[PDB]
């Protein structure tokens, strides 16, 4: 259960990285 | 631009050097003598190299009593 | 705005917004009470600290 928890939080953070990069608010001039 | 004379004017002027070629060395010599006379040891209560331990004592004069610590140091010094 | 019986009664206690005494008013007297309070805090601090030790005042559980 602890290993599951640590790996789950880690996986959420890698997903978060993917959205923050590829689905960011695009910068607009 | 706050008014005072610029530092670069002061420290390149002959008159600054006339005052300070005497005050700077005087201060330095006074510091020197404060040590060389031994006076520094007595003002601050710092042991001389021969005053950390008695000849055959070999435990440190550690202060162990809050309110009679001053007396302990005086007895330790005895 | 809505009036109520109790709000009518209390109205005078909330009607002087912004009202001031002229100039420095009682500022110097306030300063005296502040200085006395500083001294008071210093005294209770020093007693608890054992920096100020008073006859009949044994700061410990053991006479208390």
């Amino acid at each position: 259960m602890e290993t599951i928890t640590y790996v789950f939080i880690f996986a959420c953070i890698i997903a978060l990285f993917f959205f923050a990069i590829f689905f960011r608010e695009p910068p607009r001039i | 631009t706050t008014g005072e004379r610029p530092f670069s004017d002061i420290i390149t002027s002959v008159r600054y050097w006339v005052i300070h070629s005497i005050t700077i060395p005087a201060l330095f010599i006074a510091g020197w003598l404060f040590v060389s006379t031994g006076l520094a040891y007595d003002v601050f209560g710092t042991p001389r190299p021969d005053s950390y331990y008695a000849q055959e004592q070999r435990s440190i004069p550690l202060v162990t009593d809050r309110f009679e610590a001053k007396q302990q140091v005086e007895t330790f010094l005895e | 705005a809505r009036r109520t019986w109790l709000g009518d009664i209390l109205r005078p206690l909330n009607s002087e917004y912004g009202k001031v005494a002229p100039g420095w008013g009682t500022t110097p007297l306030m300063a005296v009470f502040m200085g006395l309070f500083l001294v008071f805090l210093l005294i209770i601090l020093e007693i608890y600290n054992s920096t100020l030790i008073l006859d009949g005042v044994n700061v410990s559980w053991k006479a208390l």
């Binding site: - | 670069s8 004017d9 420290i11 002959v14 190299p49 | -």
Partner: protein
Amino acid sequence: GGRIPLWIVATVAGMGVIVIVGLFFYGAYAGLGSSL
């Protein structure tokens, strides 16, 4: 205004710093603090 040029004041002052710090390093090897 100044009679003594700033580059001389700097050079002499800097040299004075080197001397006094030099002395402090010498002292790490002699007398008190020298381990000897």
